[PDB]
Structures are given as C-alpha cells and as structure tokens.
Design a binder for these strands. Structure first.
Lengths: 210, 148, 226
RNA sequence: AGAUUUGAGUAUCGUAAGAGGACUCCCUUAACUUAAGCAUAUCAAUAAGGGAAGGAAGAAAAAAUAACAAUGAUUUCUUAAGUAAUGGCGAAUGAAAAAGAAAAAGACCAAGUUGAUAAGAGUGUAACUAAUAGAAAAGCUAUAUUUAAAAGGGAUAAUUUAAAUUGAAUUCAGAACGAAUAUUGAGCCAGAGAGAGUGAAAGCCUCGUCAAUUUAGAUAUAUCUUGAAAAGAAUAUGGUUUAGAAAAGAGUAAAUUUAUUUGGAAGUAUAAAUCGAAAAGGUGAUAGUAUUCAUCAAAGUCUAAAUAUUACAGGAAAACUGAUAGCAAAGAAGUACUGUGAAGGAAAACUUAAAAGAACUUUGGAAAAAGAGUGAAAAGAGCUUGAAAGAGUAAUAUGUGAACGGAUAAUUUAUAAGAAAAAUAGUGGAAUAUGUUAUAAAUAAAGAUGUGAAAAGAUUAGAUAUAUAAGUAGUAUAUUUAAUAAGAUUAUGUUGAAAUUUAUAA
RNA sequence: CGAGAAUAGAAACUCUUGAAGAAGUAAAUUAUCUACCCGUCUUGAAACACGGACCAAGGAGUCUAACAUGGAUGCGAAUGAGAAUAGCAGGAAAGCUAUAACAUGAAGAGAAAACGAAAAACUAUGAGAGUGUAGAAAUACAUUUAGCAAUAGUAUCUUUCAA
RNA sequence: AUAAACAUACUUUGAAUCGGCCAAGUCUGGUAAGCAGGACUGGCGAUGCGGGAUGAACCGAACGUCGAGAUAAAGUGCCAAA
RNA sequence: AAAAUGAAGACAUUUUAACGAGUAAGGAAACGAAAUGGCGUAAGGACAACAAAAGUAGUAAAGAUUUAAAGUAAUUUAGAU
RNA sequence: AAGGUUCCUAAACAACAUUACUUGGAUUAGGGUGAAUCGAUCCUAAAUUACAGAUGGAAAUCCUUAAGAAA
RNA sequence: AAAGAAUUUAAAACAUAUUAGAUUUAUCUGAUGUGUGAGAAUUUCUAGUUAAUCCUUUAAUAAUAAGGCUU
RNA sequence: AAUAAAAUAUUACUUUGGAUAGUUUAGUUUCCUGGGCGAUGAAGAACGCAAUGAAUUGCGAUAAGUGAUAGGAACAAUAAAAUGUGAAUAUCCAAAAUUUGAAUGCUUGAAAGUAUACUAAGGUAUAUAUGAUAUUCAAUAUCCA
C-alpha cells in the first residue's frame, strides 16, 4: 500500500499525467530490457530506448529482429525497418510497436549511454550491498531466539501441525441456533453433501479391497 | 432507511395516501401556531388550556444559581457511603466513633425526611434540613451538622 | 406539544459544520509538540493557583486560577520579576480573598520551588552563578549547620527572597507542572465521635433563627423612626 | 532695513489611486413572506446600493463579574438555553455570569518630575514614573536576590521543506489466439499485493509503490568559536544629606427630548438639538432620596496564540454524477447565436490493435455503383452496440359503414411422451427388515466453597548525594533499609451431571 | 325369523390409440356467446366535461432541526459523556481509552416569600400452588393455601387561599 | 325466553371525511317540478352478477379459481334456453 | 382460529373448521409455529469449486431481437441470432 | 447614413436564390482603394465635461468663470 | 425552668492616639502604636413588655412609586 | 355473390433515429498548504507575430520564440535547414516587453493628432492630492530702525 501522501492512487489522474507529460518524462517511460548477452556485460536491467538500436520483438504476430528507425514519443511507439505493411497502392509504411514488446540486442552507445550505463551499474551494486546488510540483521535476530535453526528453513517445504487438540466451549450447542436461515441452509447442505461424498468414498474403498 | 418508508409502498396509488376529495395542499390552517384564538382555539383549549394569558411576577434577571439546592431523603443517605461501611458501624452507640455522611461533598445541599433510616447512629453534615429530616435522624440516635 | 422552532430566518447560511474537527487535533497536537521541542519549559503551562469557584453552587470545589497575587509571591519568598521567567503565572489583578487562600497558594509555590531546577543562564562551567556558588559554598555549610540545629531543637525577621535552585542536571522534560502538584488530596471517608452535645444540637432551630433574624431588621428600623 | 508669523510657486526624494473582496470591520430606517385579513411585529444587519482591509481581520489588559469557602485581558468551542426576558404578551424574537476546554503576554503616550535645559520641536525633545498604587531628581549606604561581553558573525548536530537519485521478484515452459497479462505446469519477491501503460484480465515487462540516500532552504533548536569571565550592572525592602511638597485623558460623563436599536422591561447601545460637571467619581439592570456595604477607576494607543474561508493557486480523497447526468461548458464554452443596450446563452463523447482509410478494371457527364483488395471482423468514415415510433422488401392470412380484447371448440403449423417385456414350476438369493455381539463417534457442569503467589504502586519510619531552607516530625528528586493495608492479575484442591443415540464389521 | 357374541368363507382385471407424433400448450383464421375512452373533479361521464397525434429518455413525500407514541437493543437510581477536548498504536475523516463539566431522571407543590412526603399502610375482586373423589381418555366436583398486575374506595403525610 | 370464548372490556397512535344523491302504504313551502327542505329505514356513492330491451338507485342476490345439481326475481310463438 | 409436532425437513410444517366483494384509507423492517407475503433498479461490506489455484467470462460478458418454460401476479429462467 | 469586401477576374455548381441554372450579391484563389488643391484635421451653435471651490452619511451632485495667488 | 465544646497556627481595612516632614487650604503626606477581629457561648420553653406583620423590586434597610395574588 | 389493389396482423432483412450496454484527459463536495497584484504601470481590452494558420494555444517589432542553467537525440501533415561543437523539453533566473487601460502633459468618437524641456528621427520628464528638505517670493499679519 502507498504511504506517500503526495502521490495519488486515482486512475484518472494517472492517465491525465500520461497524456500531458512533456518530452523529458516521455523518454524515461519508453524503456526496454537488455538481452542476456548485454545484461551480463553491463549488469543493467533496462535502459530508455534509442534510435539506431537493434531490438527483437517478443510479443506479437511477427517476432522479427530489426533496427530501430523511429522513436515516436508523442504516440509512445517505436518503428522497425523489418516490420512494414504495404499500403494497397504499393508504398510501404512502418508498423508501430510498443517499446515493452521488444528487447535490445545491440546498443547504440556514443558517449552518454556509456556514462548512463556506468551510473546504472553502480546503483544496482549499491542496493545489493544494502539488502545484504539488512538480511544478516534479520538472520542475526533469528539465531538469538532459535539457536538450533538456520534461516534457510523459510525457503523449503513447511510441515503443518497435525495435532488436533479440541476445546470444550458451552456454545457449540447454540451454533446451529445462531445462524440466519440463508446461512443455516447453506451450512446444512454442505454437511449433507460432505457426508454423501464420504459414503461413496467408503463404498469405493470396500469395493477396491474386495 | 428510505426503503422502509410508506412512499415505497404507495407507488401506483394516485394520491399517495392523502385523499382525493381533500387533496394534499400547501397549508391546513396556517403556518406554525397560527389562529391560536380563532380556528385552532379548540386545540389550545383542549390540549393547552392555560397557554394564553399572564401569571406571576416578572424576574428581570433571574439568578438561577440561587435556587440550586439538590435534595436527598433520609432513607437514601446511607447509599452515599455504601452498604459495606453501613454494616461495619452497625453496632455503634454514643461515645465511640461514628461515620460522617458529607452530603455537600457528594453534591447534595438539603436533606429531606422521607422513608425510614436504619436503626444505627449516624452524623449527617449538610447545609439545610427539613423538620422531619432532623426528627428521623435524632429518633435513630444521630446528630445533625450544619455547613457553609 | 407546542412547537418553537427558529428556522424562519435563512438558517442555510447560518449552518456551521465540523468537518475540520479531526484535523484540529492533528494541528493542535503537532503545534503542541513543536513548542515542546523549541523550548520545553515554555509548554510546561506555567504553574497556576488553586482558587475556589464562584457562587454557592460551586464554592466547595477548587480549580486552577490565573496567576499568583503579589502577596503570595512575597509569602513564598519569590521575586515577582523573576517569577515570570521560571514558569510561574502572576496576576496582580487578583485581590487576596482570604488567609486560607494565601496559605494554600503559598504551599503551591514553595512545593513548586523545591521541584524546580533552573539551568545556568550560560552553559559554560565558567558562569558567575556557578562560580559564586563555589565561592560561598564554605559559608553554606556553616549556615546549613545552625539551620539544621535550631530546627532539630525547636521541634521574627526572615529572608525577603530565597535562592533560585540553579545547578546542572539531566533534562527530564515534564510537559506541565499543574498535574504534578495536585489541587486536592484524595478524599477518604471522614468519621467522628458521637458526643452528647452533638445529639442535642438542634439544626433546624438554628437555621430558622438565623433566617428570622435577617427578616426582622426591617421591623427594627421601622419601629425606630416612630 | 532687520527679527518673526502665515500662505504660495518651483526643484529633489517618496507616497495614494486601479484589480480582488470567499472569510473581516462598517454606513443605510427594502419588499416578497408569516401573522390563515392587516396597520406594530416577522422576514431582518436580510437582498440590492456604498466605503475600508489582511493572510487572517475584529477584540484585548476592567470606571469587569458577583454577593461566593469568591473570581480576574481578549478570542474560539461545550453547557447554561429555546432559559430570564421581549411581543396586537398574538404570530413570533431571545441573551449573559457562574462552570468545562484550546491558547496564553503584556506594554506604552498624555498629565507629573529633571532643568548652565536639547540639522530639526524650548509654544518643548530626551530621561524616570505606580496595588505598600504622594510619584519624580543627585550622591551615599544595609540586607536579601539575579547575573559571562551584549548585539552580530562562522562550524556541526537535530527538526522540518523541496529537488534529484536509488528502489525487489518468471526478458519462465506448453497449448491456443490477429494479439497474452488470460489458461495449464513449475518457480521467485514482498517494510513493495496503491496505481497507470502494454494487440486481452500482469505482485515478478515498463513507470512507480515499501525501506532509503544525497544536495540545497530555514529554525530564534542546542552546541563549539570570535569570548575575555572581569569591571560592573540589575531586582525589592530600608536608613541617610540635599532637591521637591505633584498628576491621573472636557463639549467628555451625565441630564431633557427625538429617532433607530436591544432579551434589557420607568430606557441596553448609538446619533442629533439643547444643556453641561467634579477638592473626582462609575457600577450592583424597577423610577426616587438618604445611610452603610461591595467592586472598579471611563472619556488616548499598541499587542502574538488559540478562530473564519464556496475568491484564487497547488495537492489528496469520495458508499457523489457517468454525456437529457455532473459546473452553462468532457471538442477553438461564457464559444456559436440574439438584442441599441443593460444583458441572455446553447448543442455536439466513441472506427480499428495498428489507417493497414479501399485505389486497379468496367459502367456513368460526374457523384457514385459492381468487381478487386485491407483487416480477426467493414467495424467504410453519417464508422463500437444499434431499441421504439415511421417506412421498404419477402413469406403467410383475412374482409359488406370502425378496429382491438375475453370464454369455447374446429382447421393448419410448431413443440413434444418409450425400450422395456407375462404366467407356472428346478437353481439363484440382493438391497433392505428384524435382534445379538464388538468398535467408533457425539451428547452430560451451571455454579458453590477452600489454600496460595503476585507487577506497578500507596502510607510510615531511617540512611546516603544534591538543591533550597520560614522559628511549624523542614521540603523535592534519585538509590537503598525496613514495616503495614490493599492489590489488578494469577495458580491449585474439594464439591456436583451417563448410558443413551447414531454409524460401522460380522 | 332372528340382533349380540363365538366359530368359518370367498378381489385383482379386459380392449383401442400414440416418435408414421398421444395428451397438453402456443400462434394465425373461422364460428356462437361476450366487450362504450383512458386519467381526473364530481351525487352522477362512454359523454356534446377537461388533458391525451406517436415513441424513447428524464419526471414529483426528500434533507436538516425540536417533540410525542410505538416495535427491536444496552444499562438501570441511574443512563449518556463520539461536550468540547486530551492521549494510543499505524502512516488511519476509521478504531480504542479518558472517575468529567453538564443533559434527562431520582420530589413535589406555590406568583413569590417561605417550604418540602408512612399508620414499615387498609378494604374488595382477582394471577398461581396443593390434596381427595369420580367419571374414567381427556376431564368434572370437594377442600387447603397465596393473594402479584389492574380497577375502585380508604386512612396518613408534603405544598397551596384552594387537592 | 333466545343468542354470545377467534365472547367481552378496552388502551395508545393515527389515516381519510363532514359538496352528497335515490326510494317511500312519510311531512313542510310551492300551481307544480327530474323543485327546496326535514323524521325513520334501506340503498347508490364504494357495486360487480341474473331479470326489467336499454338505465347509479327498481326486483333477486352481493363476488377466491373451477365441476355437477337443485333454485331466486322472472319467463316458455321466433329473435331466446324453456 | 384451535389442537399435534418441532434443530432444520420444507412447499412458510400436519390436521380440522369457518371464511374470501370494495372507492378514500391503513397494515415499515426483524420476530419457528414468525404482529401480511413478495418482485425489480443502482451502489457499499461480505459469502459463492472446502483437498494449497475456490462464482461466470475470447470454447464469447453486458446489451439488443424473438422462441419456450416457471410463477395468480410483479417478474424470473433457458435456447437461437 | 447603414452594410463591410458584397467590387474585378479566373476555376468550379455539393448546398442556397419555393422548377432548373452552364447564371449569381452563392464556393474556392488571386487582384483592387494613390490628394499640398475633395473631405476629416481648424472654428464655434444648440449643448457637453475637467482642476480648485460649494454640497452630500454615501455613491456622487452643483458650479463653467462665479467663489481661485488658477484659467 | 430544661438540655448545650463551641476546631486549631503565614492578615489587611483604618476609628484612631504619638511623632518626622510640608501647607494654608473644605489642607495634606510617611512611620511608629493598641484594640478592632481574632477563634485551640447557643438554642428551646412558659409569663410578660416593645416593635414589626399579605409577597417582590435579586449587596442591606427605610417613606414614595411600581409589580404580584384573589374578586 | 366475388376481388385482394388499398387496409390490417406476425416474423426475418434493410432503412430514418440515436435509446440501451461497455467507457472516461470532465465535473461536484470535503479536507491540507498558501492566499505570493499595481506609478518599477496591474487586472482587462485591442492589434500583431509560425515556411505553408481561419480559430485556439504561446508570445511582443529579439514575435508558436532569445540568452543562461539543467536536459540528453528528436519533430513530422508536407517539405527545408540545423543537430552529441548539444535536437526536443523544463524554469519563481537574464535581456526584451507594440496601442491602450488607475492611465498620469493636452486631446480622444470609430481621433487622425499635438506643446515644452533634456539627451533631424528616436527615447525620457511634465495629471490630481500629498510628507520632508532646498530655493524664490506674497501679506505692515506681529514687532520694528
């Protein structure tokens, strides 16, 4: 849940700021994800898209890989040389693609992407070392209470408590008399249905045994 | 709950339960207590027979705090200290130590005499006393104290 | 029932709604906190007297008043010029109502002055008052000997003003001093010994004699001029 | 001639005007309406007209309440209270002290005093000046008491404001679709499962969100330094020799009358005409005189905080409306359009994922039509869906001055009910019934009465350290030594209801 | 001849039609019977009384405040204290906690001054609980006991010129 | 004598209504009126059904949806069942 | 209306008896033997595949046109386009 | 005066001029208004409006050379 | 004639005397001082006498005035 | 007695119409923070400015934009030129800001204009009321040689 009182959770206000956003905030919104080869080289997840980049469409009718020929920020789309449609009379027009359906396979990095990528790389590392500091502190407090256990138990399977200790409370007799008719009838039908299923399960097991 | 009003049950009835011969018009005899002496005189005679007139002397500025005098009867005196204390001092007489009931501390100024007191001595401290209040306290073996 | 409803005027422009009420709490509480952080002595809601309420309907109750009279400060040996600087309310407009009011509110000031810890005007240890306390500390010990003695043996001219309690201590920040010094001690069940004279005291006759005496002054004056 | 007074011109440096007026302070004698008519009254400090202000304004430091075991500037909220009172005593109008809270803050002129008096004032600047309320000046002094070199600079911290940055986890696999976020399967994150976008429904695709970081801006917030820690200074009650032997708001308070106003009623407030004080006096609301009592000390000024806001600007929310609704206005809306003018004042949302918005042929003067093609689908631009009223086409049926409806049948059409199976006589008993055993389950206690422990505390008497000290078991804090009274909470005995009903396997 | 009663006796069937469409139901037409224009004012309208050419969408007992009765609810000589306001966790127009001013009530009468309630009540009828007998199935009588609510009437007490 | 226990006695809160009209082995004013106004009762208003050809009041009789019968007012040459 | 039965069946129980016209008007909700019974519109809080993937939906929602079924009725349900 | 591009030309006829129009004061696009001597500008008529002054609770009104160290 | 202990420590109004100053005018201004005002009787009742006596004008009375209550 | 042309009825399809359903860059209300205009010329009005603009938007003779600082590769209906030696885009900054409008030299009707001084053309100042200072004066107004 959001706790910053400055930002709004109104869907209508969000769309209005999307349509009326200027060019500065439109560039940072048409980002795309790097491919595996580029992610390993730069340790960067996603960067804003750029012209003369090479992308690969992953969602759509045609999953071709091409070169970005136009980054249209007013329409929030991009253009690829490979994706074209002939316009009846013969000329071809590019087909607009949303920038979230492609992944970059070859950067066009002149001088400012280099500075950006280095900045984007250190931010990932700085957050990783901060999460590690928190995680050990959480683990350190868990050992002080359960010294025989290790924090890896939370990632494995969990064994439920099978003990079924019952409690005597002088209201179970009144339970049927504390429901309204709409919820009494549904409760009784569930009991009747559950019993019949158990009866058929019992008869099947007897047949299987015999 | 607008779904439980009579309007929802009178949909389809033309007049909405107000009559056809005599409609639901704007007024039914005037606005407010109009006609208190002409056409609604039978209402004021029947249900407020002393509404019109004057009685008593005017108090130009009434000091309502001077008439403030909370009252308690004799039978209700012991409830100020409770039955626990009352039973504790049940077997006392003159000479030894007796509980004091501070009516003023509890907000009661005048002590009236109504009902019956328990047959134990007690000391009653208050601002005013009725004649029968002091008689009933003295007839049981107690004393009356003034205050303020 | 005869109806008396005053809606003939334009009440719609007279309607005041309280939609800002849940935000007055947040405003006042936050401002109340902000003052405490600024100078915590300021929000202490400076000490106030213990004065009776007016009229016989309320006269047995005590409530905080505004400001100590100049006679109560003198009785408690506090300067009226220094009183306002150490969180004491001063009301020169208050005429001393009685000796009991004078004594009761003199204890309130003395008790407050014992719990008071005034910090030095200058935080440096080289402050004159701290130095002055060291210089006359030898005289305090011999003074504290004779005072401790004739107190211990006994049990008309006094100091005009006492000393301000000035020292260096940890800042235990208390948001008000009126809730530390209670107006009235808790009331227990009072109880008395029954005497023969108590049984004989006739309260009603005393009430009517007191009333009838007041209503016979006219008869005295009327018969005098004749 | 010269010394003054008064009034002008010019020059220099400034100042007011206009916009806005939601909230704020005021001026003015509206009516509709209610009174079942209406004329006082009500509507009503209400509408219109006019003036003046700020981020708030107004008010504010008693010529105030009260009659008490007394309070104590102003403001705002609760209550008093639909109450006292007012009113053709009709309709109707209508407070305040007490009491409970938010916030708290007190200072100045005038007059008086000091007069080798002080670029501008001597027809007076400046300095002092109040509840022990005969003050005011110069120098000595006693006792209590307060006291770091002020103001202003520089630095760190803390609290806030804004901007910037960062901000996890399927770029997972199969099937299918025009298209995956949906579906199936296997995982992961979460102090982040608020929200938006993406060919279609996303916690893990993008942007953000949770936890954060950095940088700037302030605080009258603390620290260190400039800054020495001294000289002195300051508060109050006295004594002392001189100096002095006061003042305290005037066309004001009040009075007669008139008018408005008020709950204020033999006059609550304001104003006008006339009259007009003081060796003071005002108030205690029934007019008058007198004597006591109580309580204040008018006729000059300022003053933060708590409070209001439907102007306007920036934000956030919503059991609000969803294109005849919601602002008049979801598009170039106070727009088109009307009036000489003041003014009046609308209508109109949607193709598709993407224009890929048919593009070439034939007919036609052309507009267009028919093929052709795009698209998942013409959804074809008068473009999501596409009702009713009104028509056109096709199929069916009927008939003499209305038509339609209902009951009953006939004709035609439509809908629509089934796959098991006899008697007798060999075997073959199968669900179930009866009652016998065993198992399991469910179902009985509401209370009554004993014995303990116990945290935070409360009281009382000592000890230690600090501060202060009134001659009233000295007070206050902190740490301990004991003792008494109760203790929220809490542990554990005795007492007291069974033998039935279902299901299961023989 | 014969009631009662005791003892013994006897009831399981045919035919036709129906997925080549039974029974029923619906639509259209025909035939016999049947049927005046809806809403409203009005004693009375089908009216020569008024509104209505047709369709779609919109369209009219609501909100605030005071009182009273009544049904469900908590507490009960008290109830409320979501009076303002002050705190808590969580970040919250929500939730929780505040020995508390006051509101209504516990006492009533009088214009006001001044006052301020027991013979620890009485009478009548009345709800309920038993024991016996009998019919005899339920039930119907006899008798002992208690007398609540309600109604009416009495004393006694507070206030008022007057209850 | 006859009837009466879903009898009887009510209490509280409240709706609509007080323009009426008709009949007659009745009356008053008027020449009289389908006129105006009254006493008692039944109706119409608020009421459909069967009959009087038709009709607010006349006669029989008052109504959940139906089947079968005996009927009421009144009818039995045809319309029209007899 | 009166008897009988009554933790959940179900059709708002079972039996018997009497009754059912109606303008103005009234009978709010809840009340197991229910102090009238219900249909529909929109929004808010819940419930909706009980074994750890829990109402329907591109294997076609809402809407529109009709054909049939259930209900005395308000209306509901389903098929086809 | 009022209108305001309706003036001229070319292309073009979906709408408009109660049929039609190849026409148009209708659609589209261009072009077009030349002053020392004509007018405005200058003067005053009926009348109108300022600073200061007078009046008014106010908005504002009066005065037009009278009231002014003005003009 | 009969019953009656009365509650417990921080004090100012000034009625004043007596002085230290100043003043002439309805003359004032300080300080020293005691009581006041102080606290570790009061009620009932019988017989007189005096006085007052329908309620209110809200600090207490008085004579006028005004308002209440009944008719 | 006969006709089904017209008429009527039902269904399917198409048409005129824009209901219904789905939807929202718009409103309404409450709350929080501010409440920051003007002679240094405001609010308002008018005219003008884009390569192709009529409205609208932004702007003012430096015109749909200039410089500076951030910002990092676009805009597009069609061309051009510029562009990592810095395109878009952002701003409480800098320069600049036409005619008017309290409008303020005089005039102003839809009015074109025009006077003086200072620095031909351009640009500044000159309205009314008012405070302080400076300077020049007026009046025997009071004294006065």
């Amino acid at each position: 849940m959001k706790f910053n009182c400055k930002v709004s959770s109104n869907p209508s206000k969000a769309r209005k700021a999307l349509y009326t956003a200027n060019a500065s905030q439109r560039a940072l919104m048409m980002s795309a994800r790097l491919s595996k080869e580029l992610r390993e080289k730069y340790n960067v997840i996603a960067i804003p898209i750029h012209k003369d980049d090479e992308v690969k469409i992953i969602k759509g009718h045609q999953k071709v890989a091409g070169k970005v020929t136009a980054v249209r920020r007013s329409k929030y789309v991009i253009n690829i040389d490979k994706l074209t449609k002939t316009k009846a009379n013969g000329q071809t027009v590019p087909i607009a693609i949303r920038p979230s359906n492609v992944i970059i396979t070859k950067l066009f990095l002149n001088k400012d992407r280099e500075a950006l990528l280095a900045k984007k790389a250190e931010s990932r590392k700085s957050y990783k070392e901060l999460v590690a500091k928190r995680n050990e502190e959480v683990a350190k407090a868990f050992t002080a209470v359960y010294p025989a256990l290790n924090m890896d138990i939370f990632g494995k399977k969990v064994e439920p408590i099978t003990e079924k200790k019952p409690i005597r409370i002088p209201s179970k007799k009144m339970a049927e008399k504390l429901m309204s008719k709409p919820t009494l009838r549904a409760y009784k039908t569930g009991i009747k249905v559950h019993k019949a299923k158990n009866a058929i399960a019992a008869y099947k097991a007897a047949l299987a045994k015999k | 709950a607008t779904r439980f009003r009579q309007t929802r049950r009178r949909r389809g009835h033309v007049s909405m339960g107000y009559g056809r011969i005599g409609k639901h018009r704007k007024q039914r005899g005037g606005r407010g207590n109009a006609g208190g002496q002409h056409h609604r005189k039978t209402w004021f005679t029947t249900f407020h027979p002393d509404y019109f007139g004057k009685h008593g002397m005017r108090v130009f500025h009434l000091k309502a705090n001077k008439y403030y005098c909370p009252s308690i009867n004799v039978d209700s005196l012991w409830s100020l200290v409770g039955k626990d204390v009352q039973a504790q001092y049940k077997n006392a007489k003159v000479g030894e130590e007796v509980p004091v009931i501070d009516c003023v501390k509890h907000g009661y100024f005048k002590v009236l005499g109504k009902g019956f007191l328990p047959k134990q001595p007690v000391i009653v401290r208050a601002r005013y006393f009725s004649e029968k209040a002091q008689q009933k306290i003295k007839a049981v073996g107690g004393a009356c104290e003034l205050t303020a | 029932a005869v109806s008396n409803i005053h809606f003939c005027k334009d009440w719609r422009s007279k309607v005041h709604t309280w939609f800002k009420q849940p935000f007055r709490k947040i405003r006042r509480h936050q401002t109340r906190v902000e003052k405490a952080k600024a100078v915590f002595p300021a929000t202490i809601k400076s000490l106030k007297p213990s004065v009776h309420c007016m009229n016989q309907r309320f006269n047995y109750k005590l409530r905080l008043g505004r400001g100590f009279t100049l006679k109560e400060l003198r009785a408690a040996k506090i300067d009226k010029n220094l009183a306002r600087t150490i969180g004491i309310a001063v009301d020169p407009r208050r005429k001393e109502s009685s000796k009991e009011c004078l004594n009761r509110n003199a204890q309130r000031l003395t008790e407050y002055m014992n719990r008071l810890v005034v910090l030095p005007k200058v935080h440096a240890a080289t402050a004159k008052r701290l130095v002055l306390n060291k210089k006359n500390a030898e005289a305090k010990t011999k003074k504290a000997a004779e005072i401790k003695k004739f107190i211990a043996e006994h049990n008309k001219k006094t100091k005009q003003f006492n000393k301000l309690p000035v020292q260096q201590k940890e800042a235990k920040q208390v948001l008000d001093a009126n809730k530390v010094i209670r107006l009235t001690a808790p009331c227990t069940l009072e109880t008395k010994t029954l005497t023969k004279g108590m049984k004989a005291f006739d309260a009603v006759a005393h009430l009517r004699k007191a009333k009838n005496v007041a209503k016979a002054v006219s008869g005295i004056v009327k018969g005098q001029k004749k």
